[PDB]
From Swiss-Prot:
Compartment(s): Nucleus
Protein origin, superkingdom: Eukaryota
Subunit structure, interactors included: Binds constitutively to TP53BP1. Binds CDC27, which is itself a component of the anaphase promoting complex (APC). Binds PIAS1.
Protein's recorded name: DNA cross-link repair 1A protein
Organism: Homo sapiens (Human)
Amino acid sequence: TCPFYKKIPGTGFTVDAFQYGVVEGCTAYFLTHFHSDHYAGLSKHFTFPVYCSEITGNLLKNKLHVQEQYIHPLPLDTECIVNGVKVVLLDANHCPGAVMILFYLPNGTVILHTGDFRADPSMERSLLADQKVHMLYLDTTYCSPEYTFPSQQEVIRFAINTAFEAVTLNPHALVVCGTYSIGKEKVFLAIADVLGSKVGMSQEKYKTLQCLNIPEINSLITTDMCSSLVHLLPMMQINFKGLQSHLKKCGGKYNQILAFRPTGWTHSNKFTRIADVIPQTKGNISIYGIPYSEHSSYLEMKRFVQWLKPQKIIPTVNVGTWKSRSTMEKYFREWKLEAGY
Ligand code: NI
């Protein structure tokens, strides 16, 4: 059964609700982004209307085989009528194709569903500037002050400089980057660009990247591993055993691996600066964990919410424990008392 925080009152609509079967009263199923916890349940046998971005639509059609007649892509930043209700999709600054959804209810209420997002000051100049929001359905993944991490630009600066130094010292080093979902493509794309290489990967991952509308993509990626000195591998293979095994396959072309594991936050964030990050090393293999986040930090979240001044907040992450729910409610009340709404 579909939980309450996935239903939009006063409409026939659900958000990210595909794992509950036929939801009673649902006339349109919205999908915020192509991450498996959110699409869980979709397939070629789905026969209800799915509303989403163009990019999410490409992924539904090619990767999950959902039939074309049930895929409804909408442009961003554009007022659209869906089953007699005005909606707008906004860029969520998460993975490719990820949106927030603004719903203008027939009774006058306005609702924002963030999906998964990384809040940014640039959102204060979207179509959100123009009117009041009564209800906010909020991505609370990192809603606690301990969750600090650097900007995505600082993280990429660290990775490019680390890779370029290593391969310039040793032209026979291979760089490897882990992946297990869409998102974080700038990590491997930026490193390959500095090195003058395409990114090599499996046929399955190439297919996924080809759905993403990235400019000039044919110039940046390839299935021919031998021509490439940046390889992508599944995240599970980013360990000493998996990487040893990979270097054997390369036919003595390389004699060293430098590997990157993009994570979210880890408790080494509570003490160390990005500058000061060090790898795990065994022999000719070094592995860097880098904190490249596609979710808001606590401070970015707090800034957004204090600017939006919603009348009510419904968290969509960390909702399963009483301690989590209580902690989140406390911070929402501090923020409201501090800013005066
Ligand atoms: Ni996500």
